[PDB]
Design a protein around this nucleic acid. Structure first.
Ligand SMILES: O=c1ccn([C@@H]2O[C@H](CO[P@](=O)(S)OP(=O)(O)OP(=O)(O)O)[C@@H](O)[C@H]2O)c(=O)[nH]1
Length: 670
RNA sequence: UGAGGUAGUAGUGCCACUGCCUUGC
């Protein structure tokens, strides 16, 4: 390069800081809004304290950039409740407006805005790594005047190039500041040292994971090793001879190093040691950019980038900006929710979702269809006898190898809703034990096909019985499911309408082929939970919450005397078909699974963030942490919701070889 | 002795496989 053009570029690099960049008055205004927020939270959050973090304290962003504030709540306080009460305080307070919930984001945040300052603000909890890295960045910038303009210019280039937005597939701006400081560290005649010195005793490349950086104290970087060895490293080496090149030289060197000298798809841009760390050493993908935060040695901050076309776009932008300084003419390959595909912007995607008046004759037809389906699919006495007989035969055969073994029936067949053409599930009581059970099952001649699974959520052995022609699965010492199905059996016994509606829902799910657990779709347990939730959420209470009328297994179990403990007894007067149509309408519309969880444990609605399941969700009433949709993909969720809306459409519209076949038709519903 | 994410494989959306794993009541 040339010094004259370097100074010319530095003029603009400083101007971009002066205009559309943080300046002392802007920092003072940010401090003032922080004091105002402290005043707002004075009475409600005296124990807790507020911290200024992010671009607001880094001075590496822009005036438009949001105001990031952190809630350093004490140990007793928890992030969910603290953030929720913060949002409530923001809502009630008149200073701020348009207070909303942004909990869906990757980082738990609350969005706010002041009608006076007119600046977007975001309140977070925890996230001490971001605060630490921002503090380090601002300390280095204050120590080195060249760093701040360079990082500001990188941020502005990212914003103009559309890579700033994480949703659009671009990498976070903080990672760009980390890239800039990494370049400052690596380049020849480095201005700054690394905080992990190879000269320190007991240091090796394979030990990099053990080493970590805690925080900067007294302008000295503190790092710990996991006896414990700690070595203090000064931020600036005691060197009086350093390059005097303007900031434009640093910017051009950054562009040269990143565009040409460095292979973004070969090594990791992480500031841990001087030695160039190979990708295979720390076991990271070589496809896309990989970076590790200095204070987080087990996090890939570049996970936002997941599209090779985006990588090519970024590389082309780097090359063209380097050529210009030695940004336009193309559109970004925006990544979105739908299978990481371009499609339509992440905001709206095809996968994301959202008649004549009802007549007595159509309602009667619907009730007739529901009751007919129940009666036809109701397990016959002979069918129940056959089921218990095959279970008894299996138990007797097993007793030969495992004396004193108890084999219990659970689910639809016993202590639950009956059904036909439904797989049989049983529980065993007394990874090697499941293997022995599978082996002894293989020894049997009756059952021929056995498919054991020990890596599933629950160990299981499933096989097909020829004599009864039934798919029988056995779980190992699983007693939670017994109580789970007993609760629903009691619910059904309370009112016949519950049983009718659950039978109808099971028929619909089985006909629509969305009730196969092994394929990843929600099991019939989830659909029973959903129908029970609708039962409890009806404007009149059809069934009171038996619960709250190594987890809680206590709930009301007295069918006869429910009215005494249930003030609103017999309040609902709707028909079975009316209940089914209402459930379909409620789930298709007027309900959202993103901000709510399908839980029948308590009457009060439970928000998703309380369970921390940011990304349909169904909560097992007995196992709060367990989620039925954890192993469910987005595609299957959208298929299930499409099936539900199709069922709502077919059932809602009145119409004037059998009535059963007209409804629950797999072709019509799919 | 199966559905989804992650590196790779010769012919050329060309596609089926193969190394590991959360998920396969
Ligand atoms: O995540 C879970 C937790 C529990 N269960 C357990 O599944 C049971 C309900 O089982 P179903 O969903 S009517 O399956 P079916 O084929 O209709 O009858 P089956 O029971 O397999 O003989 C019920 O006891 C519940 O506790 C799951 O299937 N998935």
């Amino acid at each position: 390069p040339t010094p004259s053009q370097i100074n010319a570029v530095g003029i603009a690099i400083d101007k971009v800081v002066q205009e559309f960049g943080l300046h002392n008055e802007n920092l003072e205004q940010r401090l003032e809004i922080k004091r105002i927020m402290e005043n707002v939270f004075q009475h409600k959050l005296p124990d807790c304290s507020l911290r200024l973090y992010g671009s607001s304290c880094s001075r590496l962003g822009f005036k438009n950039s949001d105001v990031n504030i952190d809630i350093q709540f004490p140990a007793i306080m928890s992030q969910p409740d603290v953030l929720l009460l913060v949002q409530e305080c923001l809502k009630n307070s008149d200073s701020f407006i348009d207070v909303d919930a942004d909990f869906h984001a990757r980082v738990p945040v609350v969005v706010c805005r002041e009608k006076q300052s007119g600046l977007l603000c975001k309140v977070s909890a925890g996230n001490e790594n971001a605060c630490l890295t921002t503090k380090h960045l601002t300390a280095l910038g204050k120590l080195e005047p060249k760093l701040v303009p360079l990082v500001i210019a990188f941020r502005y280039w990212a914003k103009l190039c559309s890579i700033d937005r994480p949703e659009e597939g671009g990498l976070p701006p903080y990672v760009f500041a980390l890239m800039a400081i990494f370049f400052l560290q690596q380049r020849k005649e480095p201005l700054l040292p690394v905080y992990l010195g190879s000269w320190i005793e007991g240091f090796s490349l394979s030990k990099l994971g053990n080493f970590n950086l805690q925080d900067i104290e007294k302008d000295v970087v503190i790092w710990e090793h996991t006896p414990i060895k700690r070595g203090q490293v000064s931020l600036i080496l005691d060197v009086k001879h350093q390059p005097s090149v303007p900031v434009g030289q640093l910017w051009v060197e950054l562009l040269r190093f990143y565009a040409l000298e460095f292979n973004l798809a070969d090594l990791v841009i992480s500031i841990r040691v001087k030695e160039l760390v190979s990708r295979e050493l720390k076991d990271w993908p070589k496809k896309r950019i990989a970076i590790e935060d200095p204070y987080s040695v087990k996090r890939n901050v570049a996970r936002t980038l997941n599209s090779q076309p985006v990588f090519e776009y970024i590389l082309h932008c780097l090359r063209t900006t380097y050529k210009y300084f030695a940004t336009k003419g193309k559109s970004p390959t925006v990544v979105c929710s739908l299978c990481k595909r371009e499609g339509h912007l992440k905001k709206d995607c095809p996968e994301d979702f959202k008649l004549p008046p009802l007549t007595p004759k159509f309602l009667n037809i619907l009730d007739q269809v529901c009751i007919q389906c129940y009666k036809d699919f109701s397990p016959t006495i002979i069918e129940d006898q056959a089921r218990e007989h095959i279970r008894q035969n299996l138990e007797s055969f097993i007793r030969q190898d495992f004396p004193g073994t108890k084999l219990s029936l659970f689910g639809s067949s016993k202590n639950g809703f009956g059904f036909k053409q439904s797989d049989l599930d049983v529980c065993m009581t007394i990874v090697r034990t499941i293997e022995e059970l599978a082996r002894v099952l293989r020894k049997h001649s009756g059952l021929r096909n056995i498919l054991p699974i020990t890596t599933a959520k629950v160990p299981i052995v499933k096989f097909f019985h020829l004599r009864s022609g039934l798919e029988v699965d056995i779980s190992l010492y699983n007693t939670l499911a017994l109580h789970n199905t007993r609760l629903l059996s009691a619910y059904s016994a309370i009112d016949p309408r519950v049983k009718y509606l659950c039978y109808t829902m099971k028929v619909f799910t089985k006909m629509c082929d969305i009730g196969d657990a092994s394929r990843g779709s929600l099991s019939s347990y989830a659909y029973t939970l959903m129908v029970l939730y609708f039962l409890q959420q009806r404007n009149p209470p059809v069934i009171p919450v038996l619960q709250e009328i190594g987890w809680n297994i206590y709930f009301f179990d007295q069918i006869d005397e429910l009215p005494t403990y249930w003030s609103e007894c017999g309040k609902n007067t709707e028909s079975v078909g009316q209940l089914w149509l209402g459930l379909l309408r409620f789930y298709t519309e007027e309900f959202d699974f993103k901000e709510h969880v399908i839980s029948i444990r308590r009457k009060s609605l439970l928000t998703t963030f309380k369970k921390q399941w940011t990304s349909i969700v169904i909560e097992d009433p007995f196992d709060l942490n367990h989620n039925l949709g954890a192993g469910l993909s987005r595609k299957m969720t959208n298929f299930i919701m499409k099936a539900f809306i199709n069922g709502r459409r077919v059932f809602g519209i009145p119409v004037k070889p059998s009535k059963m076949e007209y409804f629950f038709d797999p072709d019509v519903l799919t």
